[PDB]
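Re-run requested by the PI after the first attempt was lost when the workstation crashed. Everything re-entered from the original request form. Ligand of interest: protoporphyrin IX containing FE.
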Amino acid sequence: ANAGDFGGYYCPCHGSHYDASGRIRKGPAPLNLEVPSYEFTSDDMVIVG
Amino acid sequence: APNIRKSHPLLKMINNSLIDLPAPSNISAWWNFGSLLAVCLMTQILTGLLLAMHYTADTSLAFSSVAHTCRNVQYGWLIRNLHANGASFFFICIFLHIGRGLYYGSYLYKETWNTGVILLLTLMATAFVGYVLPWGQMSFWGATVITNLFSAIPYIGHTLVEWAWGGFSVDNPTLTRFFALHFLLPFAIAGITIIHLTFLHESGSNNPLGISSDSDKIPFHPYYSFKDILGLTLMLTPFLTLALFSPNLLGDPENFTPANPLVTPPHIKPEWYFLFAYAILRSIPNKLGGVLALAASVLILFLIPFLHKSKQRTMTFRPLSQTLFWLLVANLLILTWIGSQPVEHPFIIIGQMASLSYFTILLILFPTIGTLENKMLNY
Amino acid sequence: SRWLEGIRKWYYNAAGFNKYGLMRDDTIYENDDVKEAIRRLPENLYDDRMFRIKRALDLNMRQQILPKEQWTKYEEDVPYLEPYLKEVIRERKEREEWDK
Amino acid sequence: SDLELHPPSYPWSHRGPLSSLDHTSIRRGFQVYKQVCSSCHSMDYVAYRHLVGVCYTEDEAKALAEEVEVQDGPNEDGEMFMRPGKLSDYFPKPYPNPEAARAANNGALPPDLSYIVRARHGGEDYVFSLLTGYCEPPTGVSVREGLYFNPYFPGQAIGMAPPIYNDVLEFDDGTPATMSQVAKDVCTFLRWAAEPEHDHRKRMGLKMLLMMGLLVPLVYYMKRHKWSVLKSRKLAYRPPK
Amino acid sequence: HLVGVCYTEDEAKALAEEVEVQDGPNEDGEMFMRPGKLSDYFPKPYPN
Amino acid sequence: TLTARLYSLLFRRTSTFALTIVVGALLFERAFDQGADAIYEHINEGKLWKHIKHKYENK
Amino acid sequence: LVDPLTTVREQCEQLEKCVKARERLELCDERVSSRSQTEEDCTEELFDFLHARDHCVAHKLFNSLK
Amino acid sequence: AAKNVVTQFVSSMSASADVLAMSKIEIKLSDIPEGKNMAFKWRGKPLFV
Amino acid sequence: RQFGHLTRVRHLITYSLSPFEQRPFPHYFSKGVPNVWRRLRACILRVAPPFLAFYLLYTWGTQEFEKSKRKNPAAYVN
Ligand code: HEM
Ligand code: HEM
Ligand code: HEM
Ligand SMILES: CCCCC[C@H]1C(=O)O[C@@H](C)[C@H](NC(=O)c2cccc(NC=O)c2O)C(=O)O[C@H](C)[C@@H]1OC(=O)CC(C)C
Ligand SMILES: C/C=C(C)/C=C/C=C/[C@H](C)[C@H](C)[C@H](C)[C@H](C)CCc1oc2c(O)c(OC)cc(OC)c2c(=O)c1C
Ligand code: FES
């Protein structure tokens, strides 16, 4: 996180660049990052799964 | 038989593969590579067998165990050092051995050659595991890609991996089951190596000129036995030098930090003896392509025998392909550098480029410069 | 513009297999055809070739070569086997075609 | 910006393929670890046991290990209980667990310094530099709350505050305990720490080199001696005509 | 185990809730108890 | 004349030869080590524990 | 008590290269702290200095250390 | 006979009969200010919020 | 393949001497060293070229990279 040419992500293994949405934009990566099942329970609460 | 050296079922084998074996008179050092490769197989099996005497295959104990095996066991440190390096002297010799064979068309002894590949492959395979064992940052993350690397194979892939290694993520199981493979595999290399030499003996050893040698051929023993013992000490001195003076010289230090399933090290440089294919893999942006490239990057050796066109065997009289050859050997030393190099324009392109000359030089250039030179002789 | 003749001469000295002192044909890898070819060789030329090869080997095995004098000259290279080898090949190609 | 500064090389007393470690220096290196790093930096792979014969004396290390109490095995009633650290104990961990340490060091994880020297490219050269080398971030560059600029560290923002200044301790041998100085001694230690074999390993290397020197020629003669039969040899083709 | 052999998923789950188990480090790192999940092993009566 | 004396007496009989390799190795060992050890240590004066062992055993 | 480091960094901070660098920096520093909105950072320039400084810092520092 | 023995000594690895379901995690969204990304230990692999 | 069934060799007289009656050392400085050079100079012009070429491609590559890192004094003259 906080590295790469798309201000989102970069994987030092083979150069896959991700956008802040977790999508793959450049490199050999095949599909965009995984988006887990989740929801917010209040103003400051966030529950994943 | 009053001989005995020939009348004894076992004893014959020896006095038939070390003594009395007809070998070409004229043979360069490039022929030792193999006898060396053996000594590695040994040094590896001996040291590792001994290092396994202290290893403890299990996440929570795996890393430390080794450390213990070093700090605690007398000369245990020396054992390790020697081992990790044999790995290299092993890949070095193998890499040279393949060289020699390539440029004397020893690949014409097909079977002896095909088996050879297998050995390489396996030696690459076994070395992949084992390095996982110490369970360092590298160990872990190498486990995770290399394995996951079979992700590419459709249908049977995602599954084959979540099996390759333990459950669903490189974790303890994968480790124990790797140790096992590692402990086991070398013994396979040993076996195949036997099969390798068998096929060889069927067809005498090659020889640098690439023309019959029956005309000469000297008794393996008196000669080559010594010659091996010599080459033994020669390319033994470096390997030892390393192991006693700058052990980790070749060993990435990043792996000295116990594995963390959560953070892959910024700057994950695979083991040197792997870089080339590594490069090829990343310079072909597509999971599958990436892998495929790689696949053939090594699995191409199998085709060299069919990509032979010269009316002559070796290429000592083929100055043309000859330099094309070094263009290759260097094109390899390049891919390597480009492999130990992060991905930016200065590189990358250089990468996929060499990672193109590579193939072509093999798949196309060679066979072309091949027939061509024959015609420059009216053939 | 550039003689294939002029070229061959190049390659020939370039291959430098004559530095060991053996004719072109003394080099051609020994495949099924060549073997049969060479097996058709008159005993004269055979023993000739042999020695040339053994000498070649002996040199090679010594890492040293043949005095600039003894190298064989391009124009004087004797294609002692090309002729037999050719019949062979066509003999075969004739058979291979007939078996279809 | 993947922009970084690479640490200059210091002629360490033990750099030479044939030069051991200055054991005196390690002794101090130890003390500086014990007295200042062993309060944040765990070092699980060593133990007083080692110090004996390498930079400390049996009785010295023993009383040296007494200096700490360690949680040990179950009672009869089965309950962890503390007791004087014996000789065989491993250097004390400062925190019960990482996340505990992270909650003690402004959210950072002071890495264990067992194999530090060889876990970071540069070893001592790096480490030394890192310590003796903090400073105000150049302009346009701003380190956040809790971190401390150090050019040599990737990110240039470290979670470790300059842990070493003049006098921080007092090497009982009478050594100008200057930063540069102490910081040196810590590194020479971190080395041995990372690979006690060092000396034994080089000495070995020495001999190993004298055998190659001696053995290889010997067998070379032998190899030539034996081949001369061929090297010498001479051909000749004598048909009848 | 019990699930499918003598108990029901929901049955065993609530069955395992019946016990609290000491579990991993905090953020502040400290053993803490929490409802026994399905994957826990039958409780030990004595610490040792 | 050493070499001749040697051969005849030591290297001729394969029985003998070996015997000197052994008794020789014993000598080579003992000597090679002491020599090596010295060469080494000397190249590291005052750095070895053997050398500081004394600030709790003098020097 | 004086740290041979600081003393040796004094001498070194004077070597031609340091100066030709220390200067290069000094400018940049006050070249960035002189503006309100600028992405420039004087890190690079800072290194070049250091890189050079410490380099001799090393060629000599360990001489005064025991 | 074989078919099974194979199947058998093939699942004698896949999976492990040991599966979890920590699918539920609670996060204080205030721990992650604007502009930065926090990583969490979640279900065998990292989690980005 | 064993010995005695290799090749139909006719008329080859070979003379070789016991190793003890000759010298293994050999004739360095006479035939020895000379041939060594006879070879460094023979293949140097066939091996070195590509390696040399790599080198360049290595340096070039590295410098350029090390350059693309340094700021363009004029990426912001304002
Ligand atoms: C004692 C002399 C001492 C040394 C030596 C030292 C070194 C050191 C190293 C080499 C690292 C960082 C390497 C890296 O690239 O991560 C490291 C890291 C931290 N340290 Fe330290 N440190 C010494 C002493 C101390 C002391 C007393 C404290 C606690 C007050 C301390 C803390 C830390 C912390 C925190 C880090 C974290 C770095 C980060 O993640 O940003 N050190 N130390
Ligand atoms: C075929 C040759 C072999 C190869 C290619 C090889 C390679 C390796 C490598 C590279 C590692 C990692 C070492 C490191 O951390 O740097 C390793 C580790 C290990 N190998 Fe091997 N190994 C081989 C054979 C063996 C054998 C025969 C055994 C025993 C059956 C063995 C047991 C181990 C052990 C104990 C480890 C773990 C400790 C360690 O990491 O050093 N190895 N091996
Ligand atoms: C497993 C390790 C291996 C060992 C120990 C081994 C051993 C041998 C040995 C000793 C020979 C005898 C001649 C020589 O030394 O060159 C030989 C020949 C050969 N090996 Fe291997 N080999 C190994 C791996 C390989 C590999 C990976 C290749 C694959 C490219 C290979 C290809 C060949 C070839 C082509 C020859 C025959 C031609 C010749 O000897 O000139 N070998 N190998
Ligand atoms: C009981 C001992 C039986 C001896 C076994 C041992 C036997 O083949 O020993 C030699 C002939 C073998 N290489 C050669 O013959 C050889 C052939 C052409 C040229 C040279 N020299 C170059 O100048 C050679 O050195 C060398 O590569 O080792 C193999 C491969 C094998 O051993 C291996 O299985 C051991 C592995 C399986 C552990
Ligand atoms: C138990 C064995 C199994 C599942 C099979 C595995 C097969 C092994 C094969 C032959 C081995 C990796 C080959 C050398 C392949 C072609 C080369 C590719 C290769 O790629 C890597 C890679 O892409 C990495 O990205 C971050 C990191 C790496 O290490 C940290 C490696 C690495 O070490 C190797 C080497
Ligand atoms: S592991 Fe992400 S780039 Fe391949």
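Saved to the shared folder this time. Residues 33 and 88 of chain C are 7 Å apart (CA to CA).
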